[PDB]
Amino acid sequence: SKPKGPRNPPPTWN
Amino acid sequence: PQLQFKDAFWCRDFTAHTGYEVLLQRLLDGRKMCKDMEELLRQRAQAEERYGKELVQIARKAGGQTEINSLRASFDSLKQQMENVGSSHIQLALTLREELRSLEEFRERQKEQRKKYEAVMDRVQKSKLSLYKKAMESKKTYEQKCRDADDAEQAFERISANGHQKQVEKSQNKARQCKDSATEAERVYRQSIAQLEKVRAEWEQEHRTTCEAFQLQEFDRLTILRNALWVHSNQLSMQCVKDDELYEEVRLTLEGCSIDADIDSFIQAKSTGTEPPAPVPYQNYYD
Amino acid sequence: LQFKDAFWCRDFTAHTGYEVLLQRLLDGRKMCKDMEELLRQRAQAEERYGKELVQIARKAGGQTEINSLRASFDSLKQQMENVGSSHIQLALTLREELRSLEEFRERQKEQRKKYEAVMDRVQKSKLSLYKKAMESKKTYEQKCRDADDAEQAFERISANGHQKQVEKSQNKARQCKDSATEAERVYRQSIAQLEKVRAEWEQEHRTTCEAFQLQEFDRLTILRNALWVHSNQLSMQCVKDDELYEEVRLTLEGCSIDADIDSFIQAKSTGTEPPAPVPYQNYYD
């Protein structure tokens, strides 16, 4: 019904 | 109390059928609205098919061959989901065109029934107006005969005092001839009112049925067009969910992308040696 | 294991470990370009798609409709232009990410060219002095071979020969022995100069390898982040579109069929009483 959307990268990155 | 078509589209003018003409124009305005809804879907389907086909070409023609390991799998995951999105939008165009075909079938269904009522109404209204013109022609004749009968009776009464028997006999047969003409003109006028009244009730019954039928057509058209807008908005909103789910697959692939893993995998596969060259020493010819 | 520890060649005249790493950077440069082309073509597709949606909304009809159904259809055209305008803005966002990647790509190429100049310099000198040292070895060995032939010739005639002819053959042996001794010093100094550049190259190779590993670590990081950002921007566009299409559903919830029919009646009604029947009118009444 409603899109999930964007998501933050894995917190272990950068 | 919900007001109906049959109760609010009459005309006090006997010779006017504006109430029917207004409703018929409303159906023609609704027919153009149905076409405008069909035109939006056809152009949207063409745009969606073109957009989908372009996404497929970008994914198939894109590069990335020089990359290896996780980053290659991640970039290949983006190209794979791009083709999936483009192919899904191509299927959306087929779904929209199916909604386009359903509306054109419904639109032509109503026109078929509307033409039937138009033929019936045009017939009874033409007969109603025809008999009305005949009844009024009978009334003008009937009234003129009554005036002729009263004038012929006043002429008889005038000369029947001191006039001769010859002039009185002429005037008495004129008064009887005019009185009979007024009686036959009254019967024709009475018969004209009888025929006109018959068609009048027929027209009132026919107009009342046509109004209820036009109200049924408008209720159906407004319902299907409201549903077409709701379905169209849902199909586009469903496409946002399908696309978002496909783009999530790229993020899932990226979660298995480790920078240190790719570097170690390249080292273990392309390493040339772990020992620098030995220094060149002096070589004595005799030692 | 690191680049500096796993890309050596026991062959003194070979620099394959450096050539392999340099080829890996060139493959990574093309991978950065392929990511740029995907963004460039996707942005072009989004601008074309967005502009087409705006034209459909502006050119669409619906003028003959009134009340709720008209407001609902006008709401669909309004949100269609908003979606098309949003996809046009998406192309600008993708092209900005495209410009960032090409900027990063040329930064690495500028730094990579600097290390290439340094390595090509010291490697050319390392190979040059090695070729010179081996030429010195061939001369030194040839002088030793000439010296042994001159000494064995002396031993031959130094048995019953005259003092004049023996001195002649021994002066040849000393002349050849001296030539071999000075050729040995030239050969020794060639080894000294070669060793100087060798240690210079090994340190330079270790520095270049460590730098190339940093560049690959940076390239893999930005390209991994660029893929995640690209997926979020496309997923964010799906959220924006759904919110715009939600405005159409909210308008449709206030769309009542019976309300539109009653609103049309109250605005176009011609009369609530049918015409009176035409009666017989007596002329004398």
Side-chain angles (χ1 to χ4, degrees), chain A residues 1-13, chain B residues 1 3-132 135-139 141-157 159-161 163 168 171-173 175 178-282 284-287, chain C residues 1-162 164-173 175-272 274-285:
Chain A
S1 59
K2 200 173 182 180
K4 298 181 180 180
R7 179 165 52 92
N8 289 326
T12 51
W13 286 15
Chain B
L3 209 54
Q4 320 287 342
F5 279 14
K6 56 177 183 71
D7 299 325
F9 287 94
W10 297 100
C11 297
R12 194 62 81 176
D13 192 342
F14 192 83
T15 58
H17 305 105
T18 305
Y20 163 75
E21 291 163 1
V22 170
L23 291 185
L24 192 52
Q25 250 293 329
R26 172 61 178 166
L27 299 188
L28 299 182
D29 294 338
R31 176 175 174 84
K32 188 57 181 181
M33 171 57 182
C34 188
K35 287 184 182 170
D36 293 354
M37 180 62 200
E38 296 168 9
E39 276 295 314
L40 192 148
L41 296 179
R42 184 185 296 100
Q43 295 178 14
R44 182 59 183 262
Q46 289 182 347
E48 226 68 21
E49 173 183 62
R50 194 178 209 184
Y51 176 59
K53 286 181 172 173
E54 187 163 358
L55 294 181
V56 176
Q57 288 303 317
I58 297 174
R60 291 180 181 176
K61 290 184 174 182
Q65 300 82 2
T66 59
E67 200 48 52
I68 54 179
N69 297 99
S70 300
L71 191 62
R72 174 60 175 282
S74 291
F75 187 80
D76 291 337
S77 183
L78 175 63
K79 290 186 300 167
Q80 187 57 254
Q81 302 301 332
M82 275 189 66
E83 184 177 27
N84 295 343
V85 168
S87 289
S88 186
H89 281 262
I90 288 177
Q91 273 289 122
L92 179 59
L94 299 188
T95 301
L96 295 189
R97 283 156 182 170
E98 183 52 40
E99 300 293 334
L100 161 61
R101 186 206 64 81
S102 179
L103 284 179
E104 308 177 83
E105 181 184 20
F106 172 83
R107 169 167 60 84
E108 297 297 345
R109 278 199 189 180
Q110 293 200 328
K111 183 178 184 173
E112 287 173 24
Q113 295 306 113
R114 188 199 75 211
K115 288 303 184 182
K116 301 186 184 172
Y117 291 102
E118 287 182 55
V120 179
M121 289 305 301
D122 289 2
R123 192 197 68 260
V124 64
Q125 287 177 349
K126 201 171 180 179
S127 190
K128 172 188 168 189
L129 296 182
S130 192
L131 295 198
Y132 182 84
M136 297 302 100
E137 289 171 6
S138 300
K139 186 172 166 172
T141 295
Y142 158 72
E143 290 177 357
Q144 182 63 33
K145 293 302 179 182
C146 292
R147 280 185 297 271
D148 287 359
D150 294 336
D151 294 354
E153 193 189 357
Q154 286 284 335
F156 165 78
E157 177 192 23
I159 320 176
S160 78
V168 163
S171 288
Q172 197 181 5
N173 290 343
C178 293
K179 246 302 178 181
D180 288 358
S181 283
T183 299
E184 169 69 18
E186 174 183 341
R187 185 199 60 83
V188 172
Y189 175 48
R190 284 185 185 268
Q191 193 171 27
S192 294
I193 299 301
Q195 300 179 6
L196 189 276
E197 172 71 6
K198 177 174 182 178
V199 175
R200 193 208 50 82
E202 174 186 353
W203 162 82
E204 177 176 321
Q205 185 70 17
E206 225 57 53
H207 176 89
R208 198 167 282 163
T209 57
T210 298
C211 285
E212 201 165 344
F214 284 1
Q215 184 172 337
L216 182 58
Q217 282 189 353
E218 279 299 287
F219 181 86
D220 293 358
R221 185 190 63 86
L222 295 178
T223 295
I224 290 197
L225 289 183
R226 187 188 63 176
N227 179 259
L229 289 179
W230 190 273
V231 169
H232 184 62
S233 68
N234 280 344
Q235 292 173 345
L236 296 181
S237 186
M238 275 299 303
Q239 192 64 31
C240 302
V241 177
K242 296 179 183 182
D243 292 9
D244 173 62
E245 286 179 355
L246 294 182
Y247 298 138
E248 168 72 10
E249 292 295 330
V250 177
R251 284 185 295 270
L252 298 180
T253 303
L254 285 164
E255 295 191 341
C257 180
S258 175
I259 310 300
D260 298 318
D262 286 2
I263 294 171
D264 290 316
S265 298
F266 161 84
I267 292 179
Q268 293 175 12
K270 304 289 299 166
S271 176
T272 58
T274 57
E275 303 300 327
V280 178
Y282 164 80
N284 184 268
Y285 182 81
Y286 303 99
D287 198 7
Chain C
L1 209 54
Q2 319 287 92
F3 280 14
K4 56 177 184 72
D5 299 324
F7 288 95
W8 298 99
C9 297
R10 193 59 82 112
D11 192 343
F12 193 91
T13 58
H15 305 105
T16 305
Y18 164 75
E19 291 163 1
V20 170
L21 291 185
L22 192 52
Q23 183 63 30
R24 171 61 178 166
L25 299 188
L26 300 182
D27 293 338
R29 175 175 174 84
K30 188 56 181 296
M31 171 57 182
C32 189
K33 287 184 182 170
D34 293 354
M35 180 62 200
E36 286 171 46
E37 273 295 314
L38 193 149
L39 296 179
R40 186 188 299 269
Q41 296 178 14
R42 183 59 183 263
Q44 167 188 148
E46 292 296 333
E47 173 183 62
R48 193 180 208 185
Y49 177 59
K51 286 181 172 173
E52 187 163 358
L53 294 181
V54 176
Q55 288 303 317
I56 297 174
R58 292 181 182 176
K59 290 184 174 182
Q63 300 82 2
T64 60
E65 199 48 52
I66 54 179
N67 297 98
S68 301
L69 192 63
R70 173 60 175 282
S72 290
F73 187 80
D74 290 337
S75 183
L76 175 63
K77 291 187 300 167
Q78 188 57 254
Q79 302 301 332
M80 274 189 66
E81 185 178 27
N82 295 343
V83 168
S85 289
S86 186
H87 281 262
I88 288 177
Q89 189 74 6
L90 179 59
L92 299 188
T93 302
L94 295 189
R95 285 156 182 169
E96 183 53 40
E97 300 293 334
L98 161 61
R99 186 206 64 81
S100 179
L101 283 179
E102 60 190 7
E103 180 185 20
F104 173 84
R105 169 167 60 84
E106 295 296 345
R107 275 201 187 181
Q108 294 200 328
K109 182 178 184 173
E110 287 173 24
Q111 296 306 112
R112 187 198 74 212
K113 288 302 184 182
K114 302 185 184 172
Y115 290 103
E116 287 182 55
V118 179
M119 289 305 301
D120 289 2
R121 190 196 67 202
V122 65
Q123 286 177 349
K124 201 171 180 179
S125 190
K126 172 188 169 189
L127 296 182
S128 192
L129 295 198
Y130 182 85
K131 190 174 187 177
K132 177 58 185 177
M134 297 302 101
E135 289 171 6
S136 300
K137 186 172 165 172
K138 183 177 182 60
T139 295
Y140 159 72
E141 290 177 357
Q142 182 63 33
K143 293 301 179 182
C144 292
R145 198 148 46 254
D146 287 359
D148 294 337
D149 295 354
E151 193 189 357
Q152 287 171 11
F154 164 78
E155 177 192 22
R156 198 171 304 146
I157 320 176
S158 78
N160 311 324
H162 291 338
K164 303 179 302 178
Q165 296 182 357
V166 162
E167 284 177 359
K168 167 198 288 185
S169 288
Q170 198 180 5
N171 290 342
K172 284 183 175 180
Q175 221 163 350
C176 294
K177 179 184 178 181
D178 288 358
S179 283
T181 299
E182 58 178 355
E184 174 183 341
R185 288 190 292 266
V186 172
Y187 175 48
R188 284 185 185 268
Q189 190 64 207
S190 294
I191 299 301
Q193 301 294 338
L194 189 275
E195 172 71 6
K196 177 76 174 183
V197 176
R198 195 277 309 173
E200 174 186 353
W201 163 82
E202 177 176 321
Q203 186 69 17
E204 225 57 53
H205 176 89
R206 196 167 281 102
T207 299
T208 298
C209 285
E210 201 165 344
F212 283 0
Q213 184 171 338
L214 182 57
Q215 282 190 353
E216 279 299 81
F217 181 86
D218 293 358
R219 185 190 63 86
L220 294 178
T221 295
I222 181 59
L223 289 183
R224 187 186 63 176
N225 284 134
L227 289 179
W228 192 275
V229 169
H230 184 62
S231 68
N232 280 344
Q233 293 174 345
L234 297 182
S235 294
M236 187 62 177
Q237 192 63 31
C238 302
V239 177
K240 295 180 182 182
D241 292 9
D242 173 62
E243 286 179 355
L244 295 182
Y245 298 138
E246 168 72 10
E247 292 294 330
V248 177
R249 285 186 296 270
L250 297 179
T251 303
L252 285 164
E253 294 192 341
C255 180
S256 175
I257 309 300
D258 298 318
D260 286 2
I261 294 171
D262 290 315
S263 298
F264 161 83
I265 292 179
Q266 293 175 12
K268 302 289 300 165
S269 176
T270 58
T272 57
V278 179
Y280 163 80
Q281 296 282 34
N282 184 22
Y283 183 81
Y284 302 97
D285 197 8

